[PDB]
Design a protein around this ligand. Structure first.
Ligand SMILES: [K+]
Ligand SMILES: [K+]
Ligand SMILES: [K+]
Ligand SMILES: [K+]
Ligand SMILES: [K+]
Ligand SMILES: [K+]
Ligand SMILES: [K+]
Ligand SMILES: [K+]
Ligand SMILES: [K+]
Ligand SMILES: [K+]
Ligand SMILES: [K+]
Ligand SMILES: [K+]
Ligand SMILES: [K+]
Ligand SMILES: [K+]
Ligand SMILES: [K+]
Ligand SMILES: [K+]
Ligand SMILES: [K+]
Ligand SMILES: [K+]
Ligand SMILES: [K+]
Ligand SMILES: [K+]
Ligand SMILES: [K+]
Ligand SMILES: [K+]
Ligand SMILES: [K+]
Ligand SMILES: [K+]
Ligand SMILES: [K+]
Ligand SMILES: [K+]
Ligand SMILES: [K+]
Ligand SMILES: [K+]
Ligand SMILES: [K+]
Ligand SMILES: [K+]
Ligand SMILES: [K+]
Ligand SMILES: [K+]
Ligand SMILES: [K+]
Ligand SMILES: [K+]
Ligand SMILES: [K+]
Ligand SMILES: [K+]
Ligand SMILES: [K+]
Ligand SMILES: [K+]
Ligand SMILES: [K+]
Ligand SMILES: [K+]
Ligand SMILES: [K+]
Ligand SMILES: [K+]
Ligand SMILES: [K+]
Ligand SMILES: [K+]
Ligand SMILES: [K+]
Ligand SMILES: [K+]
Ligand SMILES: [K+]
Ligand SMILES: [K+]
Ligand SMILES: [K+]
Ligand SMILES: [K+]
Ligand SMILES: [K+]
Ligand SMILES: [K+]
Ligand SMILES: [K+]
Ligand SMILES: [K+]
Ligand SMILES: [K+]
Ligand SMILES: [K+]
Ligand SMILES: [K+]
Ligand SMILES: [K+]
Ligand SMILES: [K+]
Ligand SMILES: [K+]
Ligand SMILES: [K+]
Ligand SMILES: [K+]
Ligand SMILES: [K+]
Ligand SMILES: [K+]
Ligand SMILES: [K+]
Ligand SMILES: [K+]
Ligand SMILES: [K+]
Ligand SMILES: [K+]
Ligand SMILES: [K+]
Ligand SMILES: [K+]
Ligand SMILES: [K+]
Ligand SMILES: [K+]
Ligand SMILES: [Mg+2]
Ligand SMILES: [Mg+2]
Ligand SMILES: [Mg+2]
Ligand SMILES: [Mg+2]
Ligand SMILES: [Mg+2]
Ligand SMILES: [Mg+2]
Lengths: 37, 142, 91, 166
RNA sequence: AUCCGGUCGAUCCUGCCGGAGCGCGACGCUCUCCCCAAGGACGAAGCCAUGCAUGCCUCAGGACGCGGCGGAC
RNA sequence: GUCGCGGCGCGCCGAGGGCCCGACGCCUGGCGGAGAAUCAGGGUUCGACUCCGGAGAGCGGGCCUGCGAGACGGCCCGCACAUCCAAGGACGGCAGCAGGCGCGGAACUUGCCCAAUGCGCGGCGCGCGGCGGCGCGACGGGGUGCGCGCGAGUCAGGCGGGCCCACCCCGACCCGCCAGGGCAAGGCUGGUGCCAGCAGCCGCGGUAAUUCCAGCUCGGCGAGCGUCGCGCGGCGCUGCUGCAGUUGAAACGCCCGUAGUUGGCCCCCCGCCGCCACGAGGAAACGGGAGCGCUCCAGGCAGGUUGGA
């Protein structure tokens, strides 16, 4: 069992109500499109 | 009506149900007790033991790989099982006499994926969670 | 402090006492302490104030009063620890 | 047994059956926008309280117009809904208890009352000012954002006269 | 009073396998403030060092003792 | 004989008594109910523990005293275990409260008080019961900002409290955990090259990987998220409501036949069952449910002539 972890060895946004407010204003066309960013 | 009826057939409507319930594999599996006996854990979520050997397991027909596992000797009843060590690189943290904690893969003791003969996995070694041990949150001594 | 209201007065002459419930009103300030309202509650050495509590925001307090006429009344009919918080027995 | 073993307690919210569903996953953040909601448990709670009044109403409406249980709980239900302002005066029949929504529950929070009364610039400002202890309800100071105001206590919302704002 | 994914070159089925909800425990990671609150039951009715869990009042300063009631709740 | 009836016991006489409407025997990781979990309706599963009832005090037994016990914080003996001892002897019963060992995946202090609640006796006693400590099992509420004021902490005084503290009041200072191919909301660079690894199920990986290992970015629920085992649901895959039986699993090779189940039409206005309604009688708690701003709330039964229907 000698190849264990081969690839492994060789490899302030706001909060709560206001954070969901940021999402509200951000969204209201994919979020993680390649185009917008 | 291919079923009995009439106001005075309650006894028969109960006899038929009682006899035919056992023809369901799940009801029989959960109510007959032979599985409660054959179960290595004796009907629990988890159990501990000492590691007796480290082994590799050759994957099933479509895939091709060597999965990592350990032969575990249960403390509570002196049985032999095999447990798959998950999560790349973790097989190094399992020495030749370790107190390990064993739980299931899911599916109530059925093989999962392509790993043949293994129905259990290790979640803690020597008092430390293997998730955090992989994720560099805790470290085994030396 | 300003407003001192007694309610539900049971004149109880088996124990030689008067039970009331007192409501202190004080918009923004306090009533000082259970040592202050006395003057209005009533001499004032025969008055037993207990079980007072304020409320959220502040402005109002509710408590309970016993008025014992005789002195042996407040040594006989009155509990112990009460007097130790009253300074009388001091034991 | 200690005497605390005998106290009642209970859960007040229900979680939807299919969680990852886009069409209402969107109209659900819309509500967290039109009011200031910390998370989804306060939509769950509103659905929970609407469900019970619906269930009681369907039970009563199975029944018959001259019956005592209707005569008792229909009048009770309408009186309590009207005095909480969930239902308004002109609809004095049980069959109108079915067409309510979450929104008419949300309308009688303090955060909505003081924005109708214009005591706050917005709803998020209203939230922060609520927890700052600056708005009282009829001479008593109310720290609660979720506070549910009877239309009797609705004339007496104002700044708490013990505040840095008078 | 709701379905979904997994048997074909494609197609309609039966049929299970797998997924999606609530509750009870155990394990892992994480943790600002208040209120409520369970806690050696789980084929060990296994074994117990140490301390405490039951006392209260006829016949002489008092104790002590006698007697009484309780210790079956 | 018993407090007492009774094969309860003994003598004598008879041959009865139970059974496919399931006797008898065996098994149970069996305390029963009030109840709890799930959720259209009909149902499935669990009843360790809060109230009631039963049974036990290491395991067989026997008994004294008393109105009341087959009592174990009473006694006597057998067994299995432990204890001090000059060696002759004496002695124990934590399934009471704390605490220790062992077991197991799994469960806190070797605290203070009888002040309330009740009981005993009589002002006391009470590990009942209460008050603090440990306590992300679980429940309820509020933040990590808004456009310019707060709570979280600190120090003082009240209030409360058997003694302290927590809550309230007044003064002065001041996220995280899982994921991003489909089921199922969310997509570029480097590495690796059927390896290492992912993957509940379909599947990914063979030196241009939407899935591994990372970085950036974005999704989800959120002081809580994830993994495991089980119950209910999904399930009309247990079907009374309500499944299937030509070929997918499934109509006995046939006829007779007892128990069982079922059985046309007719007289109305009597009796005896079934059924339907309405009462009487017995437990609260829980479950509903009228009224009541613990600041709201999980709650509690409050409260300002009252009330707990
Ligand atoms: K059939
Ligand atoms: K059928
Ligand atoms: K049949
Ligand atoms: K019939
Ligand atoms: K059948
Ligand atoms: K259903
Ligand atoms: K599939
Ligand atoms: K398919
Ligand atoms: K085919
Ligand atoms: K199919
Ligand atoms: K135990
Ligand atoms: K035990
Ligand atoms: K036990
Ligand atoms: K068990
Ligand atoms: K006695
Ligand atoms: K006794
Ligand atoms: K007794
Ligand atoms: K006889
Ligand atoms: K005989
Ligand atoms: K005989
Ligand atoms: K039988
Ligand atoms: K048992
Ligand atoms: K059924
Ligand atoms: K049902
Ligand atoms: K039902
Ligand atoms: K069902
Ligand atoms: K159902
Ligand atoms: K318990
Ligand atoms: K018990
Ligand atoms: K019980
Ligand atoms: K009880
Ligand atoms: K009892
Ligand atoms: K009992
Ligand atoms: K009992
Ligand atoms: K008993
Ligand atoms: K016994
Ligand atoms: K014994
Ligand atoms: K015994
Ligand atoms: K015995
Ligand atoms: K005995
Ligand atoms: K026990
Ligand atoms: K025990
Ligand atoms: K203790
Ligand atoms: K252990
Ligand atoms: K252990
Ligand atoms: K007492
Ligand atoms: K105690
Ligand atoms: K401040
Ligand atoms: K402060
Ligand atoms: K400040
Ligand atoms: K300030
Ligand atoms: K942070
Ligand atoms: K991964
Ligand atoms: K599974
Ligand atoms: K699947
Ligand atoms: K590459
Ligand atoms: K089912
Ligand atoms: K159904
Ligand atoms: K059929
Ligand atoms: K065929
Ligand atoms: K066949
Ligand atoms: K046939
Ligand atoms: K047959
Ligand atoms: K035949
Ligand atoms: K025949
Ligand atoms: K026949
Ligand atoms: K018959
Ligand atoms: K039949
Ligand atoms: K019949
Ligand atoms: K027939
Ligand atoms: K009937
Ligand atoms: K009762
Ligand atoms: Mg216990
Ligand atoms: Mg039971
Ligand atoms: Mg005893
Ligand atoms: Mg002891
Ligand atoms: Mg263990
Ligand atoms: Mg079903």
């Amino acid at each position: 069992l000698t190849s264990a972890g081969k690839v492994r060895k060789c490899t302030r946004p706001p909060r709560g109500r206001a954070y969901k407010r940021l999402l509200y204003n951000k969204n209201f066309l994919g979020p993680n499109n390649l185009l917008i960013r | 009506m291919s079923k009995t009826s009439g106001l005075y057939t309650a006894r028969k409507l109960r006899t038929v149900r009682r006899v035919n319930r056992w023809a369901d594999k799940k009801y029989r599996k959960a109510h007959l007790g032979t599985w409660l006996k054959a179960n290595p854990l004796e009907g629990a979520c988890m159990a501990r033991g000492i590691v007796t050997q480290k082994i590799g397991i050759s994957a099933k027909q479509p895939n091709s790989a060597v999965r990592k596992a350990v032969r575990v000797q249960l403390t509570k009843n002196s049985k032999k099982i095999t447990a798959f060590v998950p999560r790349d690189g973790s097989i190094t943290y399992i020495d030749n006499n370790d107190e390990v904690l064993v739980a299931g893969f899911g599916r109530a003791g059925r093989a999962v994926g392509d790993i043949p003969g293994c129905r259990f996995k290790v979640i803690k070694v020597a008092g430390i969670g293997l998730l955090a041990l992989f994720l560099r949150k805790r470290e085994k001594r030396a | 402090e300003i407003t001192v209201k007694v309610r539900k007065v049971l004149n109880n002459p088996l124990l030689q006492r008067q039970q009331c419930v007192v409501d202190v009103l004080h918009p923004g300030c306090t009533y000082e302490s259970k040592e202050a309202i006395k003057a209005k509650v009533a001499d004032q050495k025969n008055i037993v104030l207990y079980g007072f509590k304020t409320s959220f925001g502040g402005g109002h307090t509710v408590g309970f009063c016993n008025a014992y006429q005789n002195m042996d009344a407040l040594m006989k009919y009155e509990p112990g620890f009460r007097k130790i918080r009253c300074g009388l027995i001091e034991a | 047994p200690r005497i605390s073993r005998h106290r009642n307690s209970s859960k007040t919210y229900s979680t939807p059956k299919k969680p990852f569903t886009k069409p209402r996953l969107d109209a659900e953040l819309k509500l967290c926008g039109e009011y200031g909601l910390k998370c989804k448990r306060e939509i769950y709670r509103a659905r929970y309280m609407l469900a019970k009044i619906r269930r009681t109403a369907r039970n009563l409406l199975t029944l018959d117009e001259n019956d005592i249980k209707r005569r008792f709980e229909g009048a009770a239900l309408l009186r309590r809904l009207h005095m909480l302002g969930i239902l308004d005066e002109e609809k004095d029949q049980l069959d109108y208890v079915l067409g309510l929504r979450i929104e008419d529950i949300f309308k009688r929070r303090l955060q909505s009352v003081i924005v109708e009364s214009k005591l706050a610039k917005s709803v998020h400002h209203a939230r922060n000012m609520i927890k700052a202890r600056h708005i009282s309800v009829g001479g008593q100071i109310v720290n609660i954002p979720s506070y549910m105001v009877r239309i009797s206590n609705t004339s007496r919302v104002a700044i708490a006269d013990t505040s840095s704002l008078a």
